[PDB]
């Protein structure tokens, strides 16, 4: 019946360090080396938070997953296997860091799709 | 650089260049209209300076 709040560092390097054991073990890769199973492997990681209801005691775990692309690439696999599950993203800039608007969120294409059932209404007006 | 870099920088370049060929024509259209009052103005300074070359010498 708690709160939990997990933050996960680096989800690109745990992807590249099951690609390093998968080539090892010699399973077929897809796209960009990549085993085909990498996102069942992020699927069934994230999709264990949850908001458990009334009858289960009303605990919740809340997830902060961290992905890192290449000179503001993300289209690549990983960050698209990862930005078709999770409700938002937030994405951080450094155009927007060294003009001196920090934290870099880019308002423009951050996504919440929980907006205002996780505000309060003081925020919302 | 990547595609990625190279599109956004393209699409402001297009913009801009939408933006400059709209100011050109509109100045031309007020070039156009423009011409006309200095039309209209000639034969008035012309007429009060004809009236000047023999009233003010």
Do not use: C, W
């Not at chain 1, 560092?9 to 073990?25: G, I, N, P, T």
């Not at chain 1, 409700?87 to 800039?93: A, E, K, M, P, S």
């Amino acid at each position: 019946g708690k709160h939990v709040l997990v933050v996960y560092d680096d989800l690109s390097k745990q992807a590249a360090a099951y690609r390093e054991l998968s080539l090892l073990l010699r399973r077929p890769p897809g796209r960009e080396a990549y085993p085909g199973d990498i996102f069942y492997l992020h699927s069934r990681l994230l999709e264990r938070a949850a908001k458990l209801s009334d009858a289960k005691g009303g605990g919740s775990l809340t997830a902060l997953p961290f992905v890192e692309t290449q000179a503001g690439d993300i289209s690549a696999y990983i960050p698209t296997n990862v930005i078709s599950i999770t409700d938002g993203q937030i994405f951080l800039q450094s155009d927007l860091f060294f003009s001196g608007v920090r934290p870099a969120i880019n308002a423009g294409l951050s996504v919440s799709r929980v907006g205002g059932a996780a505000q309060i209404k003081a925020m919302k007006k | 650089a990547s595609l990625r870099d190279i599109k956004t920088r393209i699409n402001a370049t297009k913009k801009t260049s939408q933006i400059t060929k709209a100011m050109e024509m509109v100045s031309t259209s007020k070039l156009n209209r423009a011409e006309q009052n200095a039309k209209s103005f000639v034969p008035y300074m012309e007429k009060i300076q004809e009236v000047v070359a023999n009233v003010a010498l």
